[PDB]
Amino acid sequence: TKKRRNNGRAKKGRGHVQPIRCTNCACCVPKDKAIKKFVIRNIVEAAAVRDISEVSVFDAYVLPKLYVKLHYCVSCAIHSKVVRNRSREARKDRTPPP
Amino acid sequence: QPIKLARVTKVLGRTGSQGQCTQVRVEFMDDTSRSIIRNVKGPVREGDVLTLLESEREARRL
Amino acid sequence: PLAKDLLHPSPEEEKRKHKKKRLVQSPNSYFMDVKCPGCYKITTVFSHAQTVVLCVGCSTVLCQPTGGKARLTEGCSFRRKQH
Amino acid sequence: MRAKWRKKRMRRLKRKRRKMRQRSK
Amino acid sequence: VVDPFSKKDWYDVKAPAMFNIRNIGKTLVTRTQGTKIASDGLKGRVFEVSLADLQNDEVAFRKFKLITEDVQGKNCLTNFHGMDLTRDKMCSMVKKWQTMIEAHVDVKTTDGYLLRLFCVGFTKKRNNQIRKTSYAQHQQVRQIRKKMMEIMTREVQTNDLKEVVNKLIPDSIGKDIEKACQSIYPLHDVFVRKVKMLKKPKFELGKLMELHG
Amino acid sequence: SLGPQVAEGENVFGVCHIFASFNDTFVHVTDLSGKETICRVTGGMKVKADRDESSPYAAMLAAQDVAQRCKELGITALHIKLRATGGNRTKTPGPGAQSALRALARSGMKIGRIEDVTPIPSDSTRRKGGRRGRRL
RNA sequence: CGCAAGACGGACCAGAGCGAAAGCAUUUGCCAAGAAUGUUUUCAUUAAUCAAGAACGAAAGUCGGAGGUUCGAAGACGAUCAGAUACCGUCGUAGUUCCGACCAUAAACGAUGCCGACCGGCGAUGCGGCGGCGUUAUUCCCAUGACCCGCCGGGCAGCUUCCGGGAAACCAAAGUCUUUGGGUUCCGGGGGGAGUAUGGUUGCAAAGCUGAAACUUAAAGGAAUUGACGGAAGGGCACCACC
């Protein structure tokens, strides 16, 4: 039976969207189909930044961040627990929780 | 290095694999404004002083 | 609702509809008298001009058209025909 | 049996059935 | 069996005198044993040194690329080769719900130092803009792009290799690109993001000694 | 092994290369240009167990050993250039990035400006794997 | 540090568009369309769907030319294994690439023919045109963008609802259907046998379209519900668990 209204993806008037590869595997999953994450993160997290301010020669130099747009295939997204199975009404919530 | 003696002001919860380590807010006896979050073994109550070995380490918050 | 006046609705409702979908099919266009600084006489210009209008004796250039309603030059003032 | 690999086994054998009709030409 | 660090000439590196901050950082050269010379083993170095170790005191996301070209002795006269932006800055800027516009102009300076300038510009979600999108049309982006090109053509032909690098550290190309493209789509996060060297001419020693004094 | 600068208030800059791949870790301190090198030590040169080459311990020994070797010449400060696996492969640094960078932050080997030198394809060629990829 | 190679066109990039579908994402140019729109210009039923008949049609495959950097059927080897001409790794042939022809098939799916009418609501958006305060933009005031309130036309989807339907899941279309007729094309008739046999036909071949029957069988199936189960996700309880 038709589980989702959109066919597990987000094209509705295309027919073909070029696939961007998986990151955990290398599965050829389509662009809209892929679970996409964009990481905005410090190059040293919280414990190392305590120290490196003393080794920084410059007057309170704020770190560069590290920018990774991840492309997950659906077998990889649920392996790493990025996404997750939801109840029949909870499925349709497109609201990303902070 | 200094060997510091940080007083427990709040117990923030219970952590560990088998649930034994106590996530604790320890206030330094030196400075009563500067504090860290520190994981502690053994039965800890509100109003005792640990013997820290260095304060470079700082326990993670959940 | 149930009882809507498709017989006798308001002008504020009829004029907020498509030119083809009103009580009676009547257009959204008009004729306006574009007067110029070159000569003094009057040319009756269609609103959605989609063409050029030229003055007498190469005095001035009146209109330069766009998609729907036409522009007029800073000076080319229009005086609208009612009939 | 997968409906794809049933279809492939029917094909390999159609290539064979044709070869046992080709020898009489 | 023996230490190959017996033969390292730590020559001090010069930034050109047309900038305030002099010091760069010291670089070993394998000493002149046999044939290969200290001038020979220094004239293939390209130095990644950022903005705030060349110009007095400004922003901290921009960098520059200087070569070695003249070896007098203990003063490495650096000539301008390239410019590249920090990719912490690059990746942070290019977010969703905007139109990134690149334009590359292969254009020749007065003296024969042919560069390749890379413009970059992003659409601003306006002050009272409620619409989530903030996209342009195609014939808005080409009009921006053709004028984005047209200003980088201006700040190469008009002036020398000197008064274009007093336009690489300021916004003295990118601001007129930001200003003169306000009338198409108001773009805000607008730089020129890279310079690349292609055709280095015959080295003039008489030229560079004014740039280093 | 002879630096000409006063030890009072002068700081000589260098560059480092923390190549944190997912099966190895390279700490590589070179000259400013990078065209001539000073010292380089890997996860394998320190530790003789193949599975934990990229580990944050075999990465800790890398920056400790260079700051043991680098101090014999007299480079004060290091510019950071963090490389990933790079190319069509994953752009994340390995488990030996935030340990090796932390390990020469325990030496006090002074820190210049920091950037990613991850060799990212602008528009990538085909990746090694397949249509269906790495099946497990 | 440069040199050569030819692939590919990130993030921007969307439940965004365009194209008959297939498909189409590097900037500058050129050739020829195309909808949507606006129109107090024309023509005056010229139309809708359509056996025969045709154009295009992912990929793989074939044939001849050029190029083979990445990739990877077949093949080789290392493990894992009882065994894996398997999953994993290392190479690697055709292939992947371009030109010239063939091929005419895909879960070519929206598993939903096409033109027309009618029947709820709303927030969005895309394009065009209109109307409506101000803000900034070239200030040198306007023409006008970038926003902004709405309106209208058509498209892409959305959200809600006892419109109504339906076996249900669901769907403003799958609705207006025992209160059964707006038009028109294709097509289904229990499961297998079987897209098989055969003839006909196209193809260089692989194969395509057309396409049975004998015999066989009491089910095959659709949707949903409860349980059991999972080498599914998450939340608990216990010194017959652990610390």
Side-chain angles (χ1 to χ4, degrees):
Chain A
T1 188
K2 188 162 186 179
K3 187 156 176 285
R4 301 181 177 77
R5 183 163 207 176
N6 58 346
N7 298 314
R9 64 199 301 161
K11 73 173 186 66
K12 293 300 299 178
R14 283 81 197 163
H16 182 80
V17 284
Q18 284 79 226
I20 314 169
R21 305 296 293 278
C22 195
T23 52
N24 200 346
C25 297
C27 197
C28 291
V29 150
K31 184 175 184 174
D32 65 333
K33 181 52 178 290
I35 292 90
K36 306 178 297 297
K37 295 193 75 171
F38 180 55
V39 179
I40 54 171
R41 188 186 66 187
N42 292 118
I43 61 103
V44 282
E45 51 183 351
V49 69
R50 178 74 175 82
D51 307 322
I52 301 154
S53 59
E54 293 294 329
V55 230
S56 67
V57 191
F58 312 140
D59 184 48
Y61 180 65
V62 67
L63 291 159
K65 302 173 181 178
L66 200 141
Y67 294 93
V68 175
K69 190 169 178 67
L70 291 162
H71 301 289
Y72 285 88
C73 82
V74 182
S75 58
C76 291
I78 310 163
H79 182 79
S80 55
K81 296 180 177 173
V82 160
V83 302
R84 188 162 292 164
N85 55 334
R86 289 186 288 177
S87 69
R88 287 174 303 100
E89 276 195 336
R91 295 192 200 283
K92 300 174 185 180
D93 295 314
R94 299 183 71 257
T95 65
Chain B
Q1 291 181 0
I3 297 171
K4 295 185 177 180
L5 292 166
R7 177 174 283 166
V8 173
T9 190
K10 184 174 179 178
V11 45
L12 295 169
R14 188 66 69 95
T15 59
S17 51
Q18 289 81 36
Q20 54 185 339
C21 311
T22 67
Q23 186 186 355
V24 167
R25 186 67 178 171
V26 286
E27 190 73 53
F28 289 89
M29 70 175 286
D30 299 326
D31 194 63
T32 187
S33 185
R34 189 180 67 77
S35 171
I36 60 166
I37 297 169
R38 187 53 169 273
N39 292 331
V40 196
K41 270 194 71 180
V44 178
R45 54 186 287 176
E46 298 189 338
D48 64 328
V49 174
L50 267 68
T51 308
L52 314 187
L53 296 179
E54 82 282 8
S55 60
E56 286 297 336
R57 292 186 294 159
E58 189 172 9
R60 288 184 290 176
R61 184 174 176 179
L62 84 156
Chain C
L2 300 182
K4 283 189 73 171
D5 47 3
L6 285 168
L7 277 166
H8 301 301
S10 55
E12 70 181 11
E13 284 179 5
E14 284 182 329
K15 292 296 297 185
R16 199 185 285 183
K17 302 182 79 177
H18 193 255
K19 65 182 189 170
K20 294 290 298 193
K21 294 195 178 189
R22 292 204 182 92
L23 179 64
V24 178
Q25 178 191 354
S26 187
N28 290 313
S29 63
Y30 57 94
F31 294 100
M32 58 184 178
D33 306 326
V34 179
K35 67 177 177 70
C36 45
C39 194
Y40 297 100
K41 73 181 66 181
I42 284 157
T43 58
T44 306
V45 178
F46 180 68
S47 56
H48 308 270
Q50 71 193 34
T51 50
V52 291
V53 185
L54 292 179
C55 193
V56 291
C58 190
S59 295
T60 189
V61 52
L62 276 76
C63 180
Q64 197 180 4
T66 61
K69 288 190 177 187
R71 287 180 294 175
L72 296 173
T73 320
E74 179 59 32
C76 291
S77 54
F78 65 92
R79 301 160 74 252
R80 193 162 165 179
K81 288 280 169 50
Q82 300 299 328
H83 186 279
Chain D
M1 173 65 75
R2 197 207 279 189
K4 194 172 172 181
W5 306 140
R6 181 50 66 88
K7 185 169 180 175
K8 187 157 178 60
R9 283 190 66 206
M10 293 308 299
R11 275 177 170 178
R12 289 174 185 173
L13 193 267
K14 278 166 73 187
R15 297 192 72 170
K16 192 182 293 295
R17 277 174 174 169
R18 280 189 299 173
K19 193 64 184 291
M20 294 295 150
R21 286 170 59 79
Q22 187 269 330
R23 297 182 65 188
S24 308
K25 287 197 173 179
Chain E
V1 297
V2 71
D3 192 17
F5 273 104
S6 184
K7 295 180 181 66
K8 300 304 171 87
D9 280 334
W10 293 96
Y11 294 160
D12 194 11
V13 181
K14 285 293 178 188
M18 63 184 170
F19 304 121
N20 205 159
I21 301 172
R22 180 65 67 185
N23 60 334
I24 280 164
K26 293 189 171 179
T27 313
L28 58 75
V29 172
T30 52
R31 280 193 165 89
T32 310
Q33 193 200 34
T35 306
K36 65 188 177 177
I37 317 167
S39 182
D40 204 61
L42 179 55
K43 207 180 275 81
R45 263 79 170 283
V46 195
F47 287 106
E48 183 70 50
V49 184
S50 188
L51 184 145
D53 202 9
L54 187 61
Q55 197 59 29
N56 199 358
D57 189 24
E58 271 296 328
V59 299
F61 60 83
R62 196 170 301 111
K63 309 171 293 190
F64 290 100
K65 299 176 176 171
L66 308 183
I67 50 164
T68 52
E69 206 173 34
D70 196 58
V71 184
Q72 183 66 43
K74 204 60 65 70
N75 293 340
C76 316
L77 277 78
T78 51
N79 188 26
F80 181 72
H81 194 264
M83 181 190 76
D84 197 54
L85 264 284
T86 314
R87 73 177 67 246
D88 172 56
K89 188 62 180 175
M90 190 64 215
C91 299
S92 183
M93 290 158 75
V94 190
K95 69 176 186 183
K96 208 177 289 179
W97 307 103
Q98 70 185 5
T99 317
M100 180 169 177
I101 303 170
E102 288 188 351
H104 64 275
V105 176
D106 194 54
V107 56
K108 184 183 170 177
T109 59
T110 63
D111 48 1
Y113 298 85
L114 183 134
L115 298 178
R116 180 177 298 286
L117 276 64
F118 288 97
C119 174
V120 68
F122 303 88
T123 62
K124 184 169 64 178
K125 182 173 182 175
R126 294 295 298 283
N127 204 167
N128 66 327
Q129 178 160 352
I130 313 165
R131 193 169 299 165
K132 189 169 75 273
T133 64
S134 186
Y135 290 114
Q137 313 306 106
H138 189 211
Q139 288 295 310
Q140 291 185 347
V141 167
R142 79 92 62 96
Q143 281 181 357
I144 288 163
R145 184 181 292 142
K146 189 172 172 67
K147 189 58 65 70
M148 273 188 170
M149 283 191 182
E150 180 169 349
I151 294 165
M152 287 189 297
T153 63
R154 188 170 62 79
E155 267 91 340
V156 170
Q157 288 186 345
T158 53
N159 55 336
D160 58 346
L161 199 267
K162 191 260 184 177
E163 280 186 347
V164 295
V165 196
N166 276 303
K167 300 182 176 181
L168 285 167
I169 303 166
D171 306 321
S172 193
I173 305 174
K175 187 57 63 186
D176 193 24
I177 283 168
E178 188 174 2
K179 280 185 181 180
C181 299
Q182 283 294 123
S183 186
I184 312 162
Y185 208 104
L187 30 82
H188 72 291
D189 209 341
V190 181
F191 305 157
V192 290
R193 72 99 177 269
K194 185 176 186 184
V195 180
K196 190 181 289 191
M197 198 70 214
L198 294 173
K199 304 174 179 76
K200 289 185 289 299
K202 179 177 179 182
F203 169 65
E204 295 199 353
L205 200 147
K207 171 57 71 181
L208 194 63
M209 284 284 169
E210 190 185 0
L211 299 171
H212 290 267
Chain F
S1 306
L2 277 161
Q5 51 84 55
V6 71
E8 188 171 14
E10 204 286 327
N11 300 330
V12 173
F13 287 108
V15 83
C16 79
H17 303 93
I18 306 170
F19 173 72
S21 58
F22 293 93
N23 52 11
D24 203 355
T25 302
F26 299 156
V27 170
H28 190 190
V29 169
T30 72
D31 297 0
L32 249 294
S33 180
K35 195 259 185 61
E36 288 285 328
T37 177
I38 294 157
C39 178
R40 186 197 65 221
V41 63
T42 80
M45 290 184 72
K46 295 280 90 180
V47 177
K48 292 302 182 72
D50 289 329
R51 73 185 181 284
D52 55 327
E53 285 175 359
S54 191
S55 176
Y57 170 48
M60 189 168 75
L61 286 179
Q64 280 179 352
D65 180 53
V66 165
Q68 192 68 237
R69 177 56 171 173
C70 185
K71 286 288 289 177
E72 294 170 359
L73 282 81
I75 299 96
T76 297
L78 297 181
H79 288 89
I80 296 173
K81 291 186 178 183
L82 186 73
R83 194 163 181 257
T85 305
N88 51 23
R89 292 180 292 282
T90 62
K91 299 176 185 180
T92 311
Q98 290 182 352
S99 59
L101 209 148
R102 193 176 183 281
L104 57 81
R106 288 305 307 168
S107 186
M109 285 288 288
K110 299 291 288 190
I111 303 304
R113 297 184 185 78
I114 310 160
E115 66 187 41
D116 283 321
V117 293
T118 63
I120 291 170
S122 62
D123 310 285
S124 185
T125 60
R126 192 179 186 78
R127 187 179 170 187
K128 192 265 283 181
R131 171 69 202 171
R132 194 158 51 251
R134 189 168 188 274
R135 284 84 64 194
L136 49 72

